[PDB]
């Protein structure tokens, strides 16, 4: 197979991989394409998401024209390091991995016209600024921006191979999302102005929507049951101070525990999430369910219970058996309709 | 490109990277400007902050001066291994890496007069010792020391390229917990045992946001403290109620501190949040000793009682309100 060996020797002979194609002659145009093999999990604490893609780059290098038996040279990824390749980096990438098990996951195909296809398998951790103000009923547009690190807009321009909506493809089976739903993605192009010049930036915004099922099970239901549990004491006779005292005290203790552990899923943001308001209102109900008993006990003249003169049923108790369940139900309708 | 290929070949022909520019002569003036991408996470547990930036360096190497071509040659980042670069390092840095996807994040931009623009995209985890005495109402001052390792001030000079405008992107930073009040650029020489070295310091004065801590620890501390006062409205003969109410609030105050001590390093001094929790625990403990005092009087000293209750129904809410006013005015 020395015929193909001569071609590779001929191509790399007098080849300077330190200069982009058309240096000082034209703008090097790079056509890109992304295939998302798996959209990895989203981390709220680090405000980052993981993506696993086939990052395909296509461009024409006239220094790599050949005539041979085969029109396309499906070469080895070792050949890539001997050829000028674009220095694409991700602007919001935190810590990315270019996999090389068991070999560098790269392909390089040189058609006889000089076109190069250069795809790699990358795992990218990207910064996704999250406005956790409607948490957990919130949605984010996690971006993915990339462009040439060194070459300005006048030297290297990026472009989408197919139509922009069709040049980023998500595999149906690959979705490593636990508590999110990938609604879709919008593909766009922009411009950034740094201290070193203009740079074309290719962006892709993935539109995630958090699934509320987990937080309903683990946070909203315990808060709702605690409010209902605290209102059970409204049906107990006023001459049972120890029993109703334990009812109010334990529920307030329970609410404090829930109010603390509910933040463990989030970064320490300075505002209040939509879940914080629900906990605050539940805290207000449970706290007031004990102040209500602290008022009935204040008017409990006798200590012995019914089986002389006996205590009458509290008028505060009768109203609290209705107003407290009713207001909480009214609050639930307002709270859920506001965010859903 | 045939002419450009010849020109770049001549620059690296006979080029010795073991010797700095003007090796036997005046020090090379290296100008530095930083484009901060983000400040990732400030940790009191590890006493460090993570910083991502577009660190750039500037210097004129006459050996890399090319004429004829009117362009600024941006070369592939693999050429940096064949050029002299300053041995810049970060003194307080713990763990740093230059990103390497899709390639190594470097740029070499030669200019015809001989200037070299050398940019790196670096993520640095730098040490930042903190004074948590006024935590969480504290301002921290985390710096970034930049220094040359091998070359003394006789062989290299560091200056901020552009003066006070040499660091950008600080305004775009939005830390969830802190707030960058300001930043300063300092240029000074540091003397070690092997000579005096140039140093640049970039310092941030982070200010903590109290909003999170109010919803996390301050408010439950207050409500539990308010909760303990409910025993002041219960008949003294209700032993099973007032004791259970009083004891429970005592436990929770200790319990609340558990969910807070684990989030911070084992510092040996008292924080401003510990002062409040110790203050709240005193009231809750005294609100329980108030009942034990009443129960002993009515039973162990029977053979006024309601006076102590009514007196405590005003003094405790008043003293705790006064306690907050003294605490908050001093710390804010």
């Amino acid at each position: 197979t020395t015929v193909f060996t001569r071609i590779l020797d001929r191509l790399l002979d007098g080849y300077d991989n330190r200069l982009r194609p058309g240096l000082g002659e034209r703008v090097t145009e790079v056509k890109t394409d992304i295939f998302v093999t798996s959209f990895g999990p989203v981390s709220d604490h680090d405000m980052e998401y993981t993506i696993d893609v086939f990052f395909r780059q296509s461009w024409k290098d006239e220094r790599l024209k050949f005539k041979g038996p085969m029109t396309v040279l499906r070469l080895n990824n070792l050949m890539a390091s001997k050829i000028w390749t674009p220095d694409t980096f991700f602007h919001n990438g935190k810590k990315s991995v270019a996999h090389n098990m068991t070999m560098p996951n790269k392909l390089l195909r040189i058609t006889e016209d000089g076109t190069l296809l250069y795809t790699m398998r990358l795992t990218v951790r990207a910064e996704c600024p999250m406005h956790l103000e409607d948490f957990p009923m919130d949605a984010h547009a996690c971006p993915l921006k990339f462009g040439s690190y060194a070459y300005t807009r006048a030297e290297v321009v990026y472009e989408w191979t197919r139509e922009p909506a069709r040049s980023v493809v998500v595999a149906e089976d690959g979705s490593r999302l636990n508590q999110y739903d990938l609604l879709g993605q919008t593909v766009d192009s922009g411009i950034v102005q740094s201290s070193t010049g203009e740079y074309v930036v290719m962006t892709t915004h993935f539109h995630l929507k958090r699934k509320i099922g987990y937080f309903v099970i683990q946070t909203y239901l315990p808060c709702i049951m605690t409010v209902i549990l605290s209102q059970v004491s409204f049906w107990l006779n006023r001459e049972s101070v120890p029993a109703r005292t334990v009812f109010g005290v334990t529920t307030v203790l329970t609410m404090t525990t829930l109010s603390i552990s509910a933040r463990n899923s989030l970064p320490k943001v300075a505002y209040a999430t939509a879940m914080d308001w629900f906990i605050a209102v539940c805290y207000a109900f449970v706290f007031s369910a004990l102040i209500e008993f602290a008022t009935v006990n204040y008017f409990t003249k006798r200590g012995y219970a019914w089986d002389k003169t006996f205590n009458s049923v509290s008028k505060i108790d009768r109203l609290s058996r209705i107003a407290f369940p009713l207001l909480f139900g009214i609050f639930n309708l307002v709270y859920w309709a506001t965010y859903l | 490109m045939s002419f450009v290929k010849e020109t770049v070949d001549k620059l690296l022909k006979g080029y010795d990277i073991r010797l700095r520019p003007d090796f036997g002569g005046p020090p090379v003036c290296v100008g530095m400007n930083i484009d901060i991408a983000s400040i990732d996470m400030v940790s009191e547990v590890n006493m460090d902050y993570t910083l991502t930036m577009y660190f750039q360096q500037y210097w004129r190497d006459k050996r890399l001066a090319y004429s004829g071509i009117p362009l600024n040659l941006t070369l592939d980042n693999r050429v940096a291994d064949q050029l002299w670069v300053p041995d810049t390092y970060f003194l307080n840095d713990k763990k740093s890496f230059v990103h390497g996807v899709t390639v190594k994040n470097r740029m070499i931009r030669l200019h015809p007069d001989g200037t070299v623009l050398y940019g790196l995209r670096i993520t640095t985890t730098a040490a930042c010792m903190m004074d948590l005495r006024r935590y969480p109402l504290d301002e921290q001052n985390c710096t970034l020391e930049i220094e040359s390792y091998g070359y003394t001030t006789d062989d290299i000079e560091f200056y901020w390229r552009g003066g006070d405008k040499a660091v950008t992107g600080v305004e775009r930073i939005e830390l969830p917990q802190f707030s960058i009040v300001e930043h300063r650029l300092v240029s000074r020489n540091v003397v070690f045992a092997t000579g005096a070295y140039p140093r640049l310091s970039l310092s941030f004065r982070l200010k903590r946001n109290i909003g999170y801590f109010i919803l996390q620890t301050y408010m439950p501390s207050i409500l539990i403290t308010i909760l303990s006062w409910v025993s002041f409205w219960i008949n003294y003969d209700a032993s099973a109620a007032r004791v259970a109410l009083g004891i429970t609030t005592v436990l929770t105050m200790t319990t609340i501190n558990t969910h807070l001590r684990e989030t911070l390093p084992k510092i040996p001094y008292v924080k401003a949040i510990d002062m409040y929790l110790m203050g709240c625990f005193v009231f809750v403990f005294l609100a329980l000793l108030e009942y034990a005092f009443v129960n002993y009087i009515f039973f162990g000293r029977g053979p006024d009682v309601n006076a102590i209750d009514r007196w405590s129904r005003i003094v405790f809410p008043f003293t705790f309100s006064l306690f907050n006013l003294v605490y908050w005015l001093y710390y804010v």
Partner: nanobody, 123 residues
Framework: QVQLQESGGGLVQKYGSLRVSCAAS????????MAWFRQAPGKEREFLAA???????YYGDSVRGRFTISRDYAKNSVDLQLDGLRPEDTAVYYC?????????????????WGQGTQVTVSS
């Protein structure tokens, strides 16, 4: 209450240049996307420009190379440098700021909107 007050100009000679401005108030939009929209009479809102937190500028096709957007993050404001104006540019220009969900080009993805500075070009 969040306010997006827009200043600039209302009348300009054909061939001139104008610099519309928009100062935010009540909230920092450092992490949001600030954009410019225009609505000619008897027509829908047309996306013009937008700059993200990473200083990345997105321009509409009809205004690419003419209108330049530039934010001042310290002052919490966004400024559009109108250039090469034509009589077809006579419209109400709006200042918008939002997260950018499903959008960055959709008027429905911006939560906070400005008042609307009328701009007129006469030949």
């Amino acid at each position: 209450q969040v306010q997006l007050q827009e200043s600039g100009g209302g009348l300009v000679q054909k061939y001139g240049s104008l610099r519309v401005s928009c100062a935010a108030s009540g909230r920092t939009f450092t992490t949001y996307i600030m954009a410019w929209f225009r609505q000619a009479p008897g027509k829908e809102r047309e996306f013009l420009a937008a700059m993200d937190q990473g200083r990345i500028q997105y321009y509409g096709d009809s205004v690419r190379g003419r209108f330049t957007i530039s934010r001042d993050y310290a002052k919490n404001s966004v400024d559009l440098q109108l250039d090469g104006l034509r009589p077809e540019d006579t419209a109400v220009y709006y200042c918008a700021a939002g997260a950018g969900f499903w959008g960055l080009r959709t008027a429905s993805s911006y939560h906070y909107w400005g008042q609307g500075t009328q701009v007129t070009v006469s030949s």
